């Protein structure tokens, strides 16, 4: 079954690539397992955009 849930997540990756998100492979695996707990994705949209900005203040 782990081959099927792999191929569906691979299909999940490309449609977030042509919509030009900043999420990569590992951030998508994190976000999918976080949504599977029952975490509201409408707030995850805010925490990723704030974290990517505060990251640039360090560099």
């Amino acid at each position: 079954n782990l081959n099927a849930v792999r191929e569906t997540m691979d299909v999940l990756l490309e449609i977030s690539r042509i919509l030009n998100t900043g999420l990569d492979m590992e951030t998508l695996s994190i976000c999918v397992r976080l949504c599977e707990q029952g975490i509201n994705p409408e707030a995850l949209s805010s925490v990723i955009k704030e974290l990517r900005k505060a990251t640039e203040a360090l560099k």
Partner: protein, 364 residues
């Protein structure tokens, strides 16, 4: 820590978890016992090792205080012996079990502000700390420990105590029923060391399968649930079937001899008493909690009963953590690091100017 640090103290009935805020593990973990012989004045590992020349009492047994001397003594040995910090340089967050009366909170802060005199404190409930690790403000939390159990609905980050169902379950009652059934099977059991061995084998060796009926029939025809255990004491006891038959009080409560309802029936009647508009919202993030994660494997069966409860045309979004016994701890560990939590934190000025009852309104 990373800013001005705080203190977190988890006053429970199975164990006392202490440490400074911003540490993901507790800086000290002691068992929940009082001194003064039945050491001279000590709480910890040494007091539990010398239980047979000391007394064992819990400060909060179900959410009521048995003795003011006992509660102040266990708090006093938490703050002064378990951690040894200065009260002026660290404010303390205290906890109370879900569904606890307001006067107990007043008596709690009355001890904390008189015996140690800190300039700031906080009193919180346990379910809000459990949910705040789960990164939400909404859910149903089923806490099942060794002296307390509550199915707590929590909506808007404020648990409504009118809709929390209180259930008295204790691990002492588990160990008691184990002693009765070992005597029914025929076994010498009259002292403390075999109580320690029997609690050890129920915490670590005991098995809980996903089905009750299949494994019981198979182990009744030929025990494949047994495994030989030869301790360093040199004592040999095993049976697989009976230790899996003992915690049946989760499904059918009359096996342990308890008078109140079983755990699935409890969350089922509780969600019957949840509002119909809030039912899907509480079910959208439902969490496992409680100390019964000491043997992992109980979780799959718990998720199965929660799936059988609510419909299956709704896709469950159940938050399933590996560890859920340090939930009260990790709540304060995240929470005191944020500066938004400091606006609900109570100072000494409001405690002296506006009485004790303001800690019920400002901290929650």
């Amino acid at each position: 820590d990373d800013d001005i640090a705080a203190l977190v103290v988890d006053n429970g009935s199975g164990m006392c978890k202490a440490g400074f805020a911003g540490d993901d593990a507790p800086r000290a973990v002691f068992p929940s016992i009082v001194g003064r012989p039945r050491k001279d004045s000590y709480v910890g590992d040494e007091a539990q090792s010398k239980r047979g020349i000391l007394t064992l009492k819990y400060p909060i047994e179900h959410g009521i205080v048995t003795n003011w001397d006992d509660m102040e003594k266990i708090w006093h040995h938490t703050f002064y012996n378990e951690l040894r910090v200065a009260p002026e340089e660290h404010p303390v967050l205290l906890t109370e079990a879900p569904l606890n009366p307001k006067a107990n909170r007043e008596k709690m802060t009355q001890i904390m502000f008189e015996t140690f005199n800190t300039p700031a404190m906080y009193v919180a409930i346990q379910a809000v700390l459990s949910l705040y690790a789960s990164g939400r403000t909404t859910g149903i939390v089923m806490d099942s420990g060794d002296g307390v159990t509550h199915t707590v609905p929590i909506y808007e980050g404020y648990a409504l105590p009118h809709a929390i169902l209180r259930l008295d379950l204790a691990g002492r009652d588990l160990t008691d029923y184990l002693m009765k059934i070992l005597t029914e099977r025929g076994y010498s059991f009259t002292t403390t060391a075999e109580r320690e061995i029997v609690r050890d084998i129920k915490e670590k060796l005991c098995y809980v399968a996903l089905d009750f009926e299949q494994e019981m029939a198979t182990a009744a025809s030929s025990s494949s649930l047994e495994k030989s255990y030869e301790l360093p004491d040199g004592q040999v006891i095993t049976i697989g079937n009976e230790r899996f038959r003992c915690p049946e009080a989760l499904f059918q409560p009359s096996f342990l001899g308890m008078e109140s309802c079983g755990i699935h029936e409890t969350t089922f009647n509780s969600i019957m008493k949840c509002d119909v508009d809030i039912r899907k919202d509480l079910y959208a993030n439902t969490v496992l909690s409680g100390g019964t994660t000491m043997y992992p494997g109980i979780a799959d069966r718990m998720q199965k009963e929660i799936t059988a409860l609510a419909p299956s045309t709704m896709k469950i979004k159940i938050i399933a953590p590996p560890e859920r016994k340090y939930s009260v701890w990790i709540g304060g560990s995240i929470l005191a690091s944020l500066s938004t939590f400091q606006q609900m934190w109570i100072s000494k000025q409001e405690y002296d100017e506006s009485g004790p009852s303001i800690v019920h309104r400002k901290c929650f």
